[PDB]
User: Which sequence fits this backbone?
């Protein structure tokens, strides 16, 4: 149906506030051809916004994470002991 | 016809993940439902992601891996136990089967792991069939020297028993065990190409011969 | 390194990946025919290796020339067993064509017989090329090449070009073999097994690449022309197909 | 595989350069992960360096040297230009370099002795005498490329033959692109210092499953014994007196497991073992007013591991001999050469500013001269100037108590050893050579002139310790025989798999005796070959046999005699009875105990320390070497181009036949 479509999309969008950007990614991938191609639903109004603000929310995690990963990969040998206490794996030969 | 390839494609991808792990990592050389799925989508993803990062010698911090594993185990828990996309439904069931089959390769002895498989087939799709198909091929790509002939002859043997089991229920039309036909052709063909065809290939390959 | 690996892989599995990707992977029924052909080739290789194992452990591994003679005899009996189980797979497909058509399907033709010839030949080709070259391709990822003990440095490339020719020869031999088995023509049935014996024997001159690689591609071109005219093609059909 | 045998020839008899770590620096060598690959070019002159540094068409080379060109200057030239040198294989020269070679520093064990800016500042950084005058410091540098030692001549001939086959240059042109190459694997898991490495090894062993330990402290056991047995479960009385005879037990070199150490280590503890077995055979040994402790320190090269651990355990009450009980101290240094029958007596000048300490040291030297007046083949001398003390184990004891100590040595100024801490300090350095018509069982019992030279020093040392222990009556019976000296020299320098080492060790320890000589490096392996062989040699040379069965020998508690707190018991193998294999095992009732030698900066867990020798060894995996041919990048681009072309042409032809298959194949 379509009543349990938006009522399942909002449970994907309200679940990405628990540090889940991949839930927002599968919200974008799955509910895209049902929100921008065919105008048929009365409840098509809010299926077009829940996939738009969740693409704003997913791109927000891209800007933070790809900055933090490069900042860690550069500033890890410059940091001293602290770069070792918050490193999951440390490469062997290189400092 | 279509429903046979719908059982070939999941059992092919589950073996590609295991064989690419055995040949590259070199380390493996609702109370009962949800709780025993939190111990695989979080406790085994934490080990499998961490062991493949050691192979390539790359630095990863805790706040990214704790963000990555949580974005794998929570979406995996909300796609299996609750509604989700079908392409993502089957893909996680491939991924949890390969992780559950890789712990049946490391923590077993050499001649003892064939005992379990043997007995199982002797007294024998569902998630149980994806595991023990993958254990057979991962065990074949581990014991011995470098021999890609033995790994890829056990890949064909499972796909034949999976083909004949679906063909056997065209007359009977009843739930079958599926295991004791593919594992029987796996127990034969592993011990028949590892030491009987493998010397015949090496003499032909030393003089560069082609049959 | 990576360049030699990804160069010799695309020579050996260049035609075979193209045929599987464009022709076979669409129909869900042809993949079953492919895996069954690979299975019967595995059974042929196993039954051929049993005889060589028994001979090499009866003759006690004493003389050096007698081991070479047993090697030649094992290659010959392996060729003969491959060409026997090809006929076995033809008989199984002919038995399974009367059951798939006109008894479990209304329309009497879900798949023709020339297509099963093509897919059986390609299945033999793919599994024989996998057992020919995949162990050689793993050594191409190292830094070194062959020739520290006075060998040729063109080992990997020539193994790739031999594997590709073996794949194409099996793909052509399947078509010619099944059309020979249909029309009860047995002079061509000897020519297919004779060409298999010939292309297996020409790899006994194999360190001399000038005469062990060019007659194999000569046989490959002639067998491709005969599998083309065998399946129904002609110059009347080529030159009136360019609209 | 049958194809990799056509590609690679492994290199079998090699020895790598290994990274070791300090509190502030790293030393040693390292490769990249998955090895370093280079084109072989041999070097026999100074024009062959220009081919590697400037004139090479194929820039990442991997050069091959004779070890007479392994000089500090050529290492500076290879280190200044690092992007063109990846690898270095050094070949062992059998005519040893006549100018000498020592890769250690100009002044060994610098900031871990007594002399500093607060105690002896005129003698602080050995301002008077450079002890290792031929030292060029090369073993304490850091290299970015591997350095392997080639020990076999046949492998060097194979590499040079492949060079002559493939890598030459005809008529002043480029070499033809199928070229021979070599790949060296030595990847070290450790980093900047031992603080970083110990921290990184403690984090991964606490916060991480499957712990990645990437260092190991250098550690072994000291081996000591008593002349008269002590209680060992308590401490001695404050009015007990011991006389300590100490000697180092180890050595190193530039390359990892190679450490022959003949002049610097082996002859010194061989002559202390001979002096111990000479002193034990005195008829008045039980009624001596004082006692004698023989001690063999291990770790003395890496800034006094064992001696500092002994002093630290001795001043924390954890050792049964206390530091107050030490009365006299006779250190035994390098005594092997003795160029004019002279044995110099080195003393410490700064502690002798105290008047009673000076009187005790003068009385010690008078006792030494009185006990050496009975041996005409040893001329005991003392240095003319008030010169400082050589680097020795007495310098750790002089940081705590100012004991009256002396150091015996063959030198007055710099070392007579031309090969201090080097690969050439073998049995030919101290002239332990045997005639060729003797069986190796008869070479065990042939007496070298070096054995007769060292037995005299052992006799002087034994009579001196007998006089320091208040003996004074049976002073003529104490005399070392050269038989035990030549057996110990043959065992430690020629062949460890004797008929005499087998009959003194245990059944469990028979794999510690290889076919060649023992190497004397303090390994990560917590007991070493050498520590066991010295312990059981001291057990036979000082202990007696008792009638006990093996069940009584493993547990001597139920025996009414044969106390366990005083002695130690071992069930050893025996000699062979003829025409069968009859080891005849028995108990040895000796005092040869072991004490742990791990430096106290590792027990106190201060891995950035300036007084307790924070030396660690990197952990690694897969040390191997191999030679092969390489193909040009032209051929690699040609085979990748042909692969892409065959793939694209196959896809185009397949799609053009498949799309028109309705028209091409009519019925
Ligand atoms: C851990 O282990 C490492 C490995 O050995 C130790 O590193 C060594 O530490 C030594 C400390 O004394 C270093 O020696 C000093 O080097 C200084 C730098 O000199 C340069 O080197 C060349 C070499 O020929 C000299 O000609 C030039 O002058 C350069 O400047 C020297 O300044 C210093 O010599 C001084 O001389 C003046 C003269 O009046 C004295 O007043 C002064 O007291 C001092 O003697 C000295 O030679 C050594 O280079 C260094 N090795 C390496 C490879 O870096 C660590 O110290 C160890 N860490 C510990 C024990 O905590
Ligand atoms: C279907 C046919 C698949 C053929 C795959 C051939 C791979 C090969 O030749 O090299 C693998 C190569 C090399 O294999 P290898 O056998 O040379 O590796 C061991 C040898 N040493 C230790 C010297 C390296 O594997 C890898 O590099 C590891 C990563 C990839 C693993 C394979 C992935 C695909 C698995 C099957 C799906
Ligand atoms: C080139 C010629 C030789 C190879 C092809 C031989 C014929 C294959 C075949 O079965 O064709 C008939 C088949 C079947 O033809 P058909 O469908 O007309 O058969 C008759 C069917 N009834 C009776 C119902 C009318 O053709 C196909 O459409 C299947 C194969 C198509 C793709 C073939 C590609 C071959 C490429 C080989 C060279 C690759 C180089 C790289
Ligand atoms: C190092 O030892 C290996 C043995 O493992 C040697 O390899 C053998 O070499 C001989 C002579 O060429 C061959 O007949 C054998 O077939 C080789 N055995 C193998 C490859 O397993 C190797 O030659 C030695 N390397 C050197 C430099 O002497
Ligand atoms: C060892 O002897 C030296 C010299 O006799 C002692 O050094 C003296 O220490 C006292 C007080 O600590 C001061 O008079 C001077 O610092 C030193 N006098 C000198 C050098 O003439 C040293 O304390 C003694 N003990 C130890 C443990 O080293
Ligand atoms: C020191 O002892 C070790 C331990 O027994 C010896 O190592 C063994 O050496 C033999 C002979 O090469 C090998 O077959 C064993 O595999 C080695 N065992 C281990 C655990 O490494 C070593 O040879 C001894 N050192 C010397 C110089 O004799
Ligand atoms: C040390 O020497 C003993 C003999 O003195 C060696 O023992 C022999 O080893 C060979 C080879 O394995 C056996 O065939 C003999 O039976 C052994 N016993 C004898 C001759 O009595 C031992 O292998 C040597 N150890 C090393 C490391 O070389
Ligand atoms: C130390 O080892 C040597 C090994 O030869 C022992 O010498 C032999 O000992 C037996 C008694 O067990 C005597 O019968 C032989 O005559 C001795 N051979 C000699 C002296 O060449 C020696 O006894 C051992 N030391 C002790 C104290 O038992
Ligand atoms: C061992 C190999 C190399 C032998 C090759 C023999 C070749 C040249 C021979 C033998 C079989 C022959 C074919 C047999 C039958 C036909 C069908 C006919 O309507 C046209 C000619 C054609 C197509 C022949 C062409 C020539 C041919 C392909
Ligand atoms: C390698 C050394 C020891 C022996 C060399 C023997 C050579 C000259 C012999 C032995 C095997 C022989 C081959 C055996 C079988 C065939 C197939 C036949 O249809 C054509 C001749 C051909 C191809 C032979 C050519 C000559 C041959 C290659
Ligand atoms: C060094 C000279 C004097 C003698 C040896 C010449 C060798 C290296 C040459 C001469 C003939 C050559 C072959 C000729 C034809 C082919 C077929 C082609 O598809 C791949 C390369 C290959 C297989 C060549 C490889 C190299 C080759 C074998
Ligand atoms: C028998 C003997 O003594 N061997 C040699 C001797 O030839 C040499 O003169 C001496 C150097 O002092 O080294 C030793
Ligand atoms: C080196 O080769 C020669 C000639 O084959 C041989 O006699 C000698 O024993 C070899 N050396 C070693 C250490 O094996
Ligand atoms: C010291 O020796 C006595 C013997 O009188 C013994 O009883 C005791 O256990 C020993 N050890 C001590 C006091 O630690
Ligand atoms: C000299 O040494 C004796 C004995 O060690 C000690 O009692 C005395 O105090 C020392 N002299 C000085 C000035 O410290
Ligand atoms: C030997 O000398 C000691 C003095 O230390 C003396 O007590 C003892 O009686 C002497 N023995 C003989 C036999 O003269
Ligand atoms: C020594 O022990 C043996 C057996 O253990 C015994 O027969 C013998 O009498 C003992 N000798 C003495 C003197 O106690």
Assistant:
């Amino acid at each position: 149906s379509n009543e349990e479509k938006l009522n399942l999309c909002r449970k994907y969008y309200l679940g990405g506030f628990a540090f889940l950007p991949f839930l927002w990614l599968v919200n974008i991938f799955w509910f895209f051809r049902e929100a921008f191609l065919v105008p048929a639903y009365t409840e098509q109004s809010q299926i077009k916004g829940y996939v738009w603000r969740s693409a704003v929310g997913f791109l927000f995690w891209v800007i933070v994470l790809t900055s933090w990963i490069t900042i860690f990969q550069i500033y890890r040998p410059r940091w001293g002991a602290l770069g070792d206490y918050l490193s999951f794996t440390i490469p062997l030969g290189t400092p | 016809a279509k429903h046979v390839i719908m059982l070939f494609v999941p059992v092919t991808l589950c073996m590609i993940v295991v064989v690419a792990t055995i040949k590259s990592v070199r380390f493996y050389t609702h109370g009962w439902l949800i709780m025993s799925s939190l111990m695989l989508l979080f406790l085994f993803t934490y080990i499998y992601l961490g062991e493949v990062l050691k192979t390539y010698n790359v630095a990863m911090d805790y706040p990214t891996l704790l963000l990555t594993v949580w974005n794998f185990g929570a979406v995996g828990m909300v796609c299996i136990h609750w509604k989700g996309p079908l392409v993502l439904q089957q893909a996680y069931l491939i991924m949890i089967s390969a992780l559950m089959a890789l712990v049946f390769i490391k923590y077993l002895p050499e001649w003892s792991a064939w005992v379990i498989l043997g007995a199982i087939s002797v007294y024998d799709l569902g998630l149980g069939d994806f595991i023990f198909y993958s254990v057979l091929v991962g065990k074949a790509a581990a014991t011995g020297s470098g021999d890609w002939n033995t790994t890829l002859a056990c890949f064909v043997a499972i796909l034949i028993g999976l083909c004949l089991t679906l063909l056997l229920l065209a007359v009977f039309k009843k739930a079958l065990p599926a295991l004791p036909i593919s594992i029987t052709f796996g127990l034969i063909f592993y011990f028949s190409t590892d030491n009987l065809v493998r010397p015949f290939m090496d003499t032909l390959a030393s003089h560069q011969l082609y049959i | 390194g990576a360049a030699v690996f990804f160069g010799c892989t695309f020579v050996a599995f260049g035609p075979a990946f193209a045929l599987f990707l464009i022709t076979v992977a669409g129909d869900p029924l042809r993949v079953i025919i492919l895996v069954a052909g690979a299975f019967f080739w595995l059974v042929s290789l196993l039954l051929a290796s049993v005889v060589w194992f028994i001979l090499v452990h009866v003759t006690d591994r004493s003389d050096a020339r007698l081991q070479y003679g047993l090697l030649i005899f094992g290659a010959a009996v392996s060729v003969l067993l491959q060409e026997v189980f090809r006929f076995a797979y033809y008989k199984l497909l002919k038995k399974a064509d009367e059951g798939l058509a006109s008894l479990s399907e209304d329309g009497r033709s879900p798949i023709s017989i020339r297509q099963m010839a093509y897919v059986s030949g390609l299945s033999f080709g793919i599994i024989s090329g996998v057992f020919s070259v995949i162990n050689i391709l793993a050594d191409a990822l190292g830094p070194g090449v062959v020739g520290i003990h006075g060998d040729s440095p063109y080992y990997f490339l020539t193994s790739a070009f031999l594997t590709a020719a073996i794949i194409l020869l099996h793909t052509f031999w399947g078509v010619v073999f099944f059309d020979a088995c249909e029309r009860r023509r047995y002079w061509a049935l000897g020519l297919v097994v004779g060409s298999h014996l010939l292309t297996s024997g020409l790899t006994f001159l194999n360190p001399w690449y000038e005469a062990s690689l060019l007659p194999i591609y000569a046989v490959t071109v002639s067998m491709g022309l005969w599998a083309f005219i065998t399946a129904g093609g002609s110059l009347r059909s080529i030159q009136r197909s360019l609209l | 595989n049958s194809v990799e045998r056509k590609i690679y020839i492994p290199l079998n008899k090699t020895a790598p350069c290994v990274r070791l770590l300090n509190a502030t620096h790293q030393i040693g060598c390292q490769s990249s992960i998955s090895g370093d690959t280079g084109v072989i070019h041999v070097v026999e002159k100074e024009e062959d360096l220009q081919w590697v540094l400037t004139d090479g068409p194929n820039p990442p080379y991997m050069v091959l040297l004779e070890s007479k060109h392994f000089t500090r200057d050529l290492m500076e030239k290879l280190k200044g230009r690092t992007s063109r040198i990846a690898g270095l294989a050094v070949s062992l020269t059998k005519p040893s370099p006549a100018s000498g070679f020592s890769p250690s520093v100009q002044c060994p064990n610098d900031g871990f002795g007594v002399y500093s800016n607060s105690y002896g500042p005129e003698f602080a950084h050995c301002r008077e005498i450079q002890w290792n005058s031929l030292g060029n410091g090369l073993a304490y540098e850091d290299f970015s490329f591997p350095i392997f030692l080639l020990e076999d001549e046949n492998e060097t001939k194979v590499i040079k033959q492949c060079y002559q086959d493939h890598n030459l240059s005809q008529n002043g042109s480029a070499p033809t692109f199928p070229l021979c190459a070599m790949q060296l694997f030595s990847h070290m898991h450790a980093v900047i210092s031992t603080a970083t490495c110990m921290r990184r090894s403690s984090i991964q062993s606490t916060f991480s499953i499957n712990p990645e330990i990437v260092c190991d402290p250098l550690s072994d056991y000291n081996v000591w014994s008593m002349l008269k047995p002590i209680n060992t479960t308590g401490t001695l009385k404050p009015d007990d007196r011991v006389v300590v005879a100490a000697t180092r037990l180890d050595s190193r070199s530039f390359f990892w497991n190679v450490a022959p150490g003949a002049e610097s280590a082996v002859a010194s503890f061989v002559t202390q073992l001979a002096a111990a077995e000479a002193l034990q055979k005195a008829p008045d040994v039980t009624t001596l007013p004082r006692n004698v402790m023989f001690v063999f320190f291990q770790g003395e090269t890496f800034d006094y591991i064992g001696s500092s651990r002994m002093v630290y355990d001795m001043e924390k009450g954890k050792f049964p001999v206390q530091l107050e009980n030490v009365d006299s101290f006779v250190e035994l240094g390098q005594v092997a050469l003795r160029t004019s029958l002279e044995l110099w007596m080195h003393t410490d000048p700064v502690s002798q500013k105290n008047e009673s300490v000076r009187n005790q040291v003068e009385d010690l030297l008078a006792t030494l001269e009185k006990s050496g007046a009975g041996v005409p083949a040893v001329i005991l001398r003392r240095p003319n100037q008030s010169q400082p003390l050589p680097p020795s184990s007495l310098q750790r004891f002089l940081r705590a108590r100012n004991i009256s100590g002396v150091v015996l040595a063959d030198h007055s100024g710099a070392f007579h050893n031309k090969y201090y801490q080097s690969i050439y300090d073998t049995a030919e350095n101290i002239n332990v050579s045997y005639p060729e018509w003797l069986s190796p069982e008869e070479d065990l019992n042939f007496v070298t002139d070096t054995a007769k030279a060292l037995a005299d020093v052992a006799t002087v040392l034994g009579r001196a310790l007998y006089e320091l222990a208040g003996g004074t009556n049976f002073s003529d019976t104490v005399q070392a025989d050269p038989q035990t000296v030549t057996r110990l020299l043959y065992g430690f320098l020629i062949k460890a798999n004797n008929s005499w080492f087998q009959s003194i060790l245990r059944q469990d320890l028979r794999s510690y005796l290889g076919d060649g000589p023992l190497q004397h490096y303090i390994a990560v392996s917590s007991p070493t070959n050498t520590t066991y062989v010295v312990q059981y040699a001291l057990a036979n040379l000082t202990g007696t046999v008792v009638n006990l069965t093996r069940e009584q020998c493993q547990d001597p508690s139920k025996v009414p005699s044969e106390n366990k707190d005083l002695y130690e018991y071992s069930w050893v193998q025996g000699p062979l009875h003829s025409n069968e294999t009859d080891r005849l095992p028995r108990c040895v009732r000796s005092t040869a105990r072991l004490a742990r030698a791990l430096s106290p900066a590792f027990e106190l867990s201060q891995w950035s320390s300036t007084e307790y020798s924070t030396w660690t060894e990197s952990r690694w995996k897969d040390i191997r070497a191999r030679i092969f041919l390489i193909a040009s990048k032209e051929l690699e681009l040609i085979t990748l181009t042909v692969g892409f072309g065959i793939l694209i042409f196959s896809l185009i032809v397949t799609y053009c036949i498949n799309a028109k298959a309705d028209v091409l194949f009519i019925a």
